[PDB]
């Protein structure tokens, strides 16, 4: 029986705890992605850094959700964090494809929780997601889509490689 | 068949991966401890901060182990991260008692892995633990022991409270 | 047969060497006091620091006496330094009571050596003690007396605790 | 009959002198590698610089061993420095493969001397190697392994070239 | 029954307390050496300063051992500090010879305690000695050996004096 | 068949490679000289530094010759570096006498290679030696000659010692 809780449904409280788990799982996935690219037999430092930075972003997302949970008088509950879906992550392309799948899953969970807060007439929750998460996900998915296009361009062809280099070295 | 691996036994490689899991589990435990103390019905911000800072230290420990794993040509393998042993953590005293138990478990795992690296004649591993982990654990356990003593002093008695305050307010 | 010695009696020379021993013994006592309060099961850092600072002051006193011994053409002679009277020092109150006893012993030895230098018509020695030691001891004994009063106030009672806090937190 | 020598076996003294020779030989090898890449018909300035910097590192390693030899009261003895194994060093790939072989040889000699100092109960020697040499070798071998992977990627294929460029030009 | 003590044998605890006594005794010896050289009939200020600086180093060594004792949950125990072996210390040469004997005794006690911590599988203790004491002793013994050589050179002969002066006044 | 080589005889190319060997051998000799003077039973730090600085100068000379070899389109070839002529180097005087012998040998090799480049009508080589090596050797041999004179003065006599000191301490 919380002294602060107001207009905060048990349904949202539970879904927030699930979303925390999903974000921490995503962080874990990215930690694994990051260290795979740091292997001596893989050795793509920029790819390693890109994923390790995402591990930190997803951890921060979970912590913001947990802070919000307490701000509303809900109770943080933590579950098993499942290990990432793969032990080795293939090429940059394979990894960036797995990343964009992961981000779309998070984005859909965000959208689901928003629809829940809408249905529960919880405008604080709706604003919280909109202001801290929904655009962050859109921007990130756009960037990953950009990357997948450039990765494919570069691995694909003479014409692709040349277009990339002209953009990178002349239009710089 | 790694191009860099030299004097790095499969036994150590595996134990390093287990130790990563233990550190990440400890980080998770501390995240849970931290957010428990941020609850409105608990509200000890300094205790929250103490534990959240430890969550970050234990995460950093795991990342240093993972970096080292790749430096030696071993292969990082990640497992399920089990949820913390409790959902609610009681008083500051209960929490600090659970923390020192956790730290002793980590310290013993460190000591076990050191004895393994000794037995495997792996001086790089031995030096790595000594230089980055063994003293950090001793210092932290000493600080927690200090804390448990002061917590007990303060909750215990008139005489205890007064000794604490004289130290804190006059000998300042 | 010293080329510099003038108006410096063998009685004073010997008493200076004894006083050096007493100061070094006091330093030793305070080193022991300091480290007792740094124990994890004692853990009063401010008390530890107060005593370790006194260990250094008493060492400096001995060195000033030794410098003076050579300035007058006397010969420094060192004896066994007896271990402190206790291995464990009890409460802050017990320790501060033992400290003020120790300081009074030093102060009386100073006063005795002054009376000796008076009787020997040795105004340099008399001035040396007055200017470097006698007021230092008075100031320190006053501070310790202040402390004993506040320690007793704080451990003693509700009324005592409250008077202390008002002084410390409002009249600040 | 040295006035300083303590706990320093003739076996270690001799092995230190051998290790000095090995380091100076490695320096010589790298000098040769460096100047090969500065030839007008080779002309890879970055490769030249990479090897000349290693020549200087290996020289510094020998000088640190020689300083330590005198610190322990051993006697530096110098032998013929054999010329490098090749007069011409092939491609960047051939050269980086020869470099990592050389580094593994040094690393194994370090490990052998550590095992010797262990067997001789010479903790100063063990600490010296650990603190100045063992991690330096691990880090360097990891970097060379990284390089071999990227060299092979780049010389190998369209897909390899593109992965490298995306890492280098976009994830920059 | 200490709340922090882990992997810290009674044998090491006791030997640490003995080593503290040895360091404090060495400090005492150096205090005596220092003041002997400040006598008007000796008057070698640089020699006085060299020894008084060593008195302070050996005191600091004891305090570091005592801090470590508490960090591990051991209990500092202090004994009688025996007076130095001599009341007068002869020439610079005699004094520097007594100093290097003293340092070798400390170094051997360090090595003995290291072998003990090895036998007790106490890697924290081993690392502590290696990182704070073993190299400090080697460096100091090397410097004293250097000094003994130069002292003997200078007191010995015309040729010795001239070699010293050329080094000091021209190669400066 | 070099694309840059012009007016660069095989005779000069070979002699340059020999001169590189001689310079590196001289560097090696000086490394040995330097560390001999750092022995605790020798302990002339200024003499050690003088020789170690020369080791670095002779290494730099070899590298400048190697750079020049490639600039002209010749091919660097390295041979065995023979160990120095002595393992122990005697007094400062003995060492400075061996140094000036070594320098005269280098100077004569320089002069021989200059006469060769003259005979081959190779003005670039002639200018290179003149501008980077011939005066450096003259200046160094003059300084060593100065030193030998002062060493002999100082070890020799009362009158010699006094002349040196007046120059050093008054005319300063
Ligand atoms: Au809403
Ligand atoms: Au909405
Ligand atoms: Au080891
Ligand atoms: Au070890
Ligand atoms: Au007087
Ligand atoms: Au008086
Ligand atoms: Au060892
Ligand atoms: Au070792
Ligand atoms: Au150990
Ligand atoms: Au050890
Ligand atoms: Au010419
Ligand atoms: Au010419």
Short description:
This is part of a larger assembly, with 6 copies of chain A (172 residues). Chain A has 172 residues and is an all-alpha fold. Chain A is built from 5 helices and no strands.
What does this protein look like?
This is part of a larger assembly, with six copies of chain A (172 residues). By secondary structure, the first copy, chain A, is an all-alpha fold. Chain A has one domain (10-171): Up-down Bundle (Ferritin). The first copy, chain A, contains five helices and no strands. In chain A, helix 1 runs antiparallel to helix 2. The longest helix of chain A is centred in the last third of the chain and has 34 residues, at 123-156. The first copy, chain A, starts with 9 loop residues before the first helix and ends with a helix. The E-F interface holds E 142, 145-147, 149-150, 158-159, 161-172 and F 40-47, 49-50, 91-93, 147, 150-151, 153-157, 160-161, 164-165, 168. The structure holds gold ion (AU) (12 copies). Residues 118, 126 of chain F line the site of one gold ion (AU). Chains A, B, C, D, E, F: Residues 53-60 are annotated as: Catalytic site for iron oxidation. Chains A, B, C, D, E, F: It comes from Equus caballus (Horse). Chains A, B, C, D, E, F: One of its GO terms (biological process) is intracellular iron ion homeostasis.
